[PDB]
Design a protein around this ligand. Structure first.
Ligand code: G2P
Ligand code: GTP
Ligand code: ATP
Lengths: 426, 325, 427
């Protein structure tokens, strides 16, 4: 019944992928060992869509952890929910890439893809009818950018008809955690633009900006940032996991948000975002959530939406709520701000609601936005790519693995192409 | 510097499936400049009637392209139409027959014949290639092992395919065996509308390179021979199973180039060639240094009267496009 | 006297579970599945002291179908009738029609045959759906085509939830509505339409419910669909059958798009203070803001209106009431059908759900009427379609299913023919 197979790549993709299984384990009432201790019967109604049943009323996640270094698996296996994962799925290499896309794509990737394609083949055969795949990686580095982008092409060859979702975190200019980031971002987007049908553009800079303004976290760690992005992955797959008044599968949101084949880079968001010291001084009905969703300082991307125009918007909701207040609020946001929405579409909002909200909250929603303001993050990395590429800097490492210099220029031709697409519809 | 796209129409006789049903002959010709359909003219360059033979079309449409592609520039000849419009009979035809042969053997026969008339100092290095598209995977015909290829960019960002078959030919008869080997392995499905239904785009590329020994001036010509498939209506054709799966793939390209050439009509900013891979290989045709000549095909039957109108408005929109030669 | 029903999409079964609970409480049918001639037209008699409805719930997505299997109304319905699929339509007219539709229609086709063969008083069919999504557009358009070639002569009463001018749940619904209407124009005998923001306005100003949900929207909609067939269930002084809605409301074989409105809609506290009679409801049903569609009836002209009352209502005041409606010059009837009034009566009154938002009323009316007021609505839907069709937006998914750009033009020119037909007929 539309089973989704999880897949991870890179260090960050294993961390946020690990946090993804943790947050959804709580609402489904899954123990860290694997047994069930929930209260509602609907949790078992669609537990098979991510997990696999087992003996003793145990449930195993349908996850495949892939990382070229072995130390990443030791941290995930030693976590709070590390033991629930299958030990056979922990496939990994020995010698890391060290932030090199050519290693994880050509040399170090070719020896491991044969070991992961047979594993996901087994998981794809275990389910009754698969819907698609969702992946977590990062454009920075070599593992998540190299290993993830490679098998995305292989999964397209093996599963060209199924949905191919991706949650890809991109770099930022002010927060730079890698010297070779624009080359990896420029080489990765050549594969993401053509292979996958959906993509969520996440930024680390906004993940720090979002925590100061509304959460008021004084000492935020990576685990706190993972809580925000993990909740976004749960909102997109809510209607098939629990019943709702209006269902919206991963395909039902893809057809509405992807108006063209190459324009599929979304922009996520989440609400209600409120600190613990100011929870009593706020309401929880629908209109305060609507204005917070479309707020510029709410999304986890560094793009200025006021500098562009939204192509389409999709706001999945959760929990019992009234439909009049939901529908009427989406009318005024597009009417009062008609300049910031394209006139060549009559309605840029996709609505959907569920009845079973997360634990600890009664009303919540997740934002999915495709907008022409995404190009400002793509040209700056392109400028960093072109600034470093024009003198052939940091290319001698990539040619040692047999990579051609023109492939960087072919990626450069793809880089200025996608930004020109959003400029056409602006 | 700037040349318009040569648009030409061709109506054919009614097939055996159409005359038995009793369709009305809606085709009405007004000279060669336009054709009338239900009191609605559509201006073109040259309209071919049902009585036009194979040799008459080649002399009128694809004759001048042999001189332009060999002069130093590029040239592209490809067709468009719905199902049962007569694209393969127009372009490929009966290869073994003298009269029924299409544009592919008539073109290559003119290259070797023209080379014999020119001087001996002009050294010609001709090389051919042939490949299909099948479930968005560029499968090669001369080699059965490889089922997919990747397109790369050259120095001036003109796209071209890598890893394809490259036979360095010397004799004209050798090309006749290559295209014959191509149709032998070409997949064909049986349907209610068409028996030999071309369910894939047959790209036949000839990188014609030439060089003079006296003046030392090297020149090349990109010669594209691409035969498009017909947009099959499932109610009329009855596509089911694997036929509908392949019918989906051909519908991508004709809709993709429809987005491109329509964007070129009003003169859009970006002109998104990249929306499909079939449109990527045709980048040089629509906006490169190629002397393009589209040849649309339409049936004179009233059963598909709406499809002919879609192809006619497709034709007149193509006349407003110009190539940057 | 029997009639088969079918529900499609998220919109279909969501009101289907809400309407059938209203049907069962009228005939004294407990939800467990048991308690002479009034219930035979919907509910069968299975052996001894057990019944089952003459309907089927079909939907590709399994979230709503299994909710009925795990819901409270489990023992009432057949376990086999709750048909479910394996792959969602996703706002695609083509995906629920060609790829996913073909591998599920064959269980659906033969089921209606055996369901009709056991029956003997089959009047017709009525389908509840919504063209505003994917499942209610493609699969609904496919099943009606395949049974029309088989049956043909039997009636077809469509019930679709169309989008509003400005409010909308989806974004691709013009493509979904424009494609499925191309097939609906030739095979649908009649199609009653309801707008999503209009029904919110019904419960806003009259029922004073500032925060309702879709469950409340289906209750008053269940009163509409149950009142049109109420004459067939119970006895009435002037009986009207299901085929009355085909001859009396369809002036031309292509113009088969009536409207719908219902009154009285009064809360519990307001019902005791507000007098209930035929005069106020007759003036209220023709009130423009009280209609279930955001289209001004003053702009158009009524071709014909079919009145149908319920409860203890004598036939004197209903004739005197419509006589006052004829004298009103604010409205305007078309010269092509001056006597466009069809009144009916049923002795059994409007029921009431325990704990429902609607209050008890001794009499009610369900007014269906055709007009050229929706001519601007089709022009509005066509106008917004031209904006996205000019940019070729959302086209790569439909052709990605198997279709092409050819029939996209066929649906456009079909609406162009449909638009001018409303303009020329309304002269
Ligand atoms: N929101 C979070 N971001 C993280 C976290 N860990 C890393 N990152 C960010 O993602 C950036 C790159 O992602 P990764 O840490 O996974 C580098 P990767 O493992 O793919 O390659 P190698 O470790 O060299 O084998 C990284 O520079 C951080 O900005 C995390 O736990 N949470
Ligand atoms: N008035 C009213 N409209 C409803 C109700 N339920 C659904 N709808 C409408 O139905 C439209 C979509 O109909 P469907 O085709 O059934 O949607 P779906 O079944 O979820 O289609 P998928 O997304 O592919 O699963 C929405 O835009 C809603 O506005 C309801 O209970 N009342
Ligand atoms: N100009 C013509 N004169 C006589 N017969 C023709 C002509 N063109 C096509 N035919 C007939 O059509 C048949 C071949 O059909 P063909 O393969 O061309 O269909 P098609 O147009 O390629 O279909 P699709 O558009 O779906 O690929 C031949 O048997 C031939 O007799």
């Amino acid at each position: 019944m539309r089973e989704i197979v999880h897949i991870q790549a890179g260090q960050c993709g294993n961390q946020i992928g690990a946090k993804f299984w943790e947050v959804i384990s709580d609402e489904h009432g899954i123990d860290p060992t694997g047994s069930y201790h929930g209260d509602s019967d609907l949790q078992l109604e669609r537990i098979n869509v991510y997990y696999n049943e087992a003996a003793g009323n145990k449930y195993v996640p349908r996850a495949i952890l892939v990382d070229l270094e072995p130390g990443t698996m030791d941290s995930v296996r030693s976590g709070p929910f590390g033991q629930i994962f299958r030990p056979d799925n922990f496939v990994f290499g020995q010698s890391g890439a060290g932030n090199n896309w050519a290693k994880g794509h050509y040399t170090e990737g070719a020896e491991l893809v044969d070991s992961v394609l047979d594993v996901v083949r087994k998981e794809s055969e275990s389910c009754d009818c698969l819907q698609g795949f969702q992946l977590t990686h990062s454009l920075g580095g070599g593992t998540g950018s190299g290993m993830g982008t490679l098998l995305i092409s292989k999964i397209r060859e093996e599963y060209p008809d199924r949905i191919m979702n991706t949650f890809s975190v991109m770099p930022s200019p002010k927060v730079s955690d890698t010297v070779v980031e624009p080359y990896n971002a420029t080489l990765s987007v050549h594969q993401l633009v053509e292979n996958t049908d959906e993509t969520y553009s996440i930024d680390n800079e906004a993940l720090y900006d979002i925590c100061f303004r509304t959460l008021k976290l004084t000492t935020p760690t990576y685990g706190d940032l993972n809580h925000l992005v993990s909740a976004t992955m749960s909102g997109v797959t809510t209607c098939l996991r629990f019943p709702g008044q209006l269902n919206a599968d991963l395909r039902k949101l893809a057809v509405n948000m992807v108006p063209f084949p190459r324009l599929h880079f979304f922009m996520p968001g989440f609400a209600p975002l409120t600190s613990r010291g100011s929870q009593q001084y706020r309401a929880l009905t629908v209109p305060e959530l609507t204005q917070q969703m479309f707020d510029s300082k709410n999304m986890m991307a560094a793009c200025d939406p006021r500098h562009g125009r939204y192509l389409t918007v999709a706001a999945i909701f959760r929990g019992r709520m009234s439909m009049k207040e939901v529908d009427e609020q989406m009318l005024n946001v597009q009417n009062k701000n008609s300049s910031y929405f394209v006139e060549w579409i009559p309605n840029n909002v996709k609505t959907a609601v569920c009845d079973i909200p997360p634990r600890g909250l009664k009303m919540s929603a997740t934002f999915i936005g495709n907008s022409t303001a995404i190009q400002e993050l793509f040209k700056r990395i392109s400028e960093q790519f072109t600034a470093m590429f024009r003198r052939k800097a940091f290319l001698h490492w990539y040619t040692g693995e047999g990579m051609d210099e023109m492939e960087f220029t072919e990626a450069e031709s793809n880089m200025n192409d996608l930004v020109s697409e959003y400029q056409q519809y602006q | 510097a700037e040349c318009n796209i040569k648009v030409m129409c061709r109506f054919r006789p009614l097939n055996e499936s159409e005359v038995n049903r009793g369709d009305k002959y809606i085709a009405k010709f007004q000279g060669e400049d336009t054709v009338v359909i239900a009191s609605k003219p559509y201006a073109f360059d040259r309209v071919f009637q049902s009585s036009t033979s194979q040799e008459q079309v080649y002399n009128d449409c694809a004759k001048k392209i042999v001189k332009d592609v060999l002069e130093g520039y590029n040239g592209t000849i490809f067709a468009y139409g719905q199902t049962s419009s007569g694209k393969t009979h127009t372009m490929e035809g009966k290869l073994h027959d003298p009269e029924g042969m299409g544009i592919i053997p008539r073109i290559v026969q003119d290259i070797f014949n023209y080379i014999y008339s020119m001087d001996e100092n002009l050294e010609f290095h001709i090389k051919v290639s042939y490949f299909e598209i099948y479930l968005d995977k560029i499968r090669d015909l001369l080699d059965v092992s490889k089922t997919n290829l990747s397109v790369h960019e050259d120095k001036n960002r003109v796209p071209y395919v890598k890893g394809c078959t490259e036979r360095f030919v010397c004799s004209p008869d050798e090309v006749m065996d290559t295209i014959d080997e191509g149709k032998s392995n070409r997949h064909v499905a049986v349907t209610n509308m068409n028996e030999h239904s071309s369910r894939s785009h047959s790209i036949f590329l000839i990188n014609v390179k030439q060089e003079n020994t006296q003046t030392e001036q090297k020149l090349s010509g990109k010669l594209y021979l691409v035969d498009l498939a017909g947009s099959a209506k499932v109610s009329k054709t009855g596509a089911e199973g694997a036929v509908l799966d392949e019918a989906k793939n051909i519908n991508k390209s004709l809709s993709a180039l429809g987005n491109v050439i329509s964007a070129l009509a009003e003169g859009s900013t970006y002109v998104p060639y990249r929306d499909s891979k079939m449109t990527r290989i045709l980048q040089d045709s629509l906006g490169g240094n190629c002397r393009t000549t589209i040849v649309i095909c339409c049936s004179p039957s009233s059963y598909n009267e709406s499809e002919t109108k879609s192809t006619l408005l497709f034709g007149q929109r193509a006349k407003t496009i110009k190539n940057t030669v | 006297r029997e009639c088969i029903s079918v529900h499609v999409g998220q919109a279909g079964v969501q009101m289907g579970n809400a309407c059938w609970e209203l049907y069962c409480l009228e005939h004294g049918i407990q939800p467990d599945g048991q308690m002479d001639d009034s219930f035979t037209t919907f509910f069968c008699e299975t052996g001894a002291g057990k019944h089952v409805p003459r309907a089927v719930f079909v939907d590709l997505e399994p979230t709503v179908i299994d909710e009925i299997r795990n819901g409270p109304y489990r023992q009432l319905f057949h376990p086999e009738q709750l048909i479910t699929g394996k792959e969602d339509a996703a706002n695609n007219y083509a995906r629920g029609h060609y790829t996913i539709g073909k591998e599920i229609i064959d269980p659906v086709l033969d089921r209606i045959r055996k369901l009709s063969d056991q029956c003997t008083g089959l009047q017709g069919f009525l389908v509840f759906h919504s063209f505003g999504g994917g499942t209610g557009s493609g699969f609904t358009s496919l099943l009606m085509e395949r049974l029309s070639v088989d049956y043909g002569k039997k009636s077809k009463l469509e019930f679709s939830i169309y989008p509003a001018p400005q409010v909308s749940t989806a974004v691709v619904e013009p493509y979904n509505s424009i494609l499925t209407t191309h097939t609906t124009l030739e095979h649908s005998d009649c199609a009653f339409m309801v707008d999503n923001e209009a029904i919110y306005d019904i419960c806003r100003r009259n029922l004073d419910i500032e925060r309702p949900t879709y469950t409340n929207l289906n209750r008053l909609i269940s009163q509409i669909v149950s009142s049109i067939t109420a004459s067939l269930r119970f006895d009435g002084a002037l009986n009207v059958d299901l085929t009355e809605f085909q001859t009396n409301l369809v002036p031309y074989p292509r113009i088969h798009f009536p409207l719908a409105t219902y009154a009285p809609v009064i809360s519990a506290e307001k019902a005791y203070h507000e007098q209930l009679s035929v005069a106020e409801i007759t003036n209220a049903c023709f009130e423009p803001a009280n209609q279930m569609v955001k289209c001004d009836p003053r702009h158009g002209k009524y071709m014909a209106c079919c009145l149908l009352y319920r409860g203890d209502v004598v036939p004197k005041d209903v004739n005197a009431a419509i006589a006052a409606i004829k004298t009103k010059r604010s409205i305007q009837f078309v010269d092509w059908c001056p006597t466009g009034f069809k009144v009916g009566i049923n002795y059994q009154p409007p029921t009431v759900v325990p704990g429902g938002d609607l209050a008890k009323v001794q009499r009610a009316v369900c007014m269906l009427s055709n007009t050229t007021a929706i001519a601007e609505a089709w022009a509005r839907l066509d106008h917004k379609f031209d904006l996205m069709y000019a940019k070729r937006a959302f086209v790569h998914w439909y052709v990605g299913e198997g279709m092409e750009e050819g029939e996209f033009s066929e649906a456009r020119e079909d609406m162009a023919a449909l638009e001018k037909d409303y303009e020329e007929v309304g002269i």
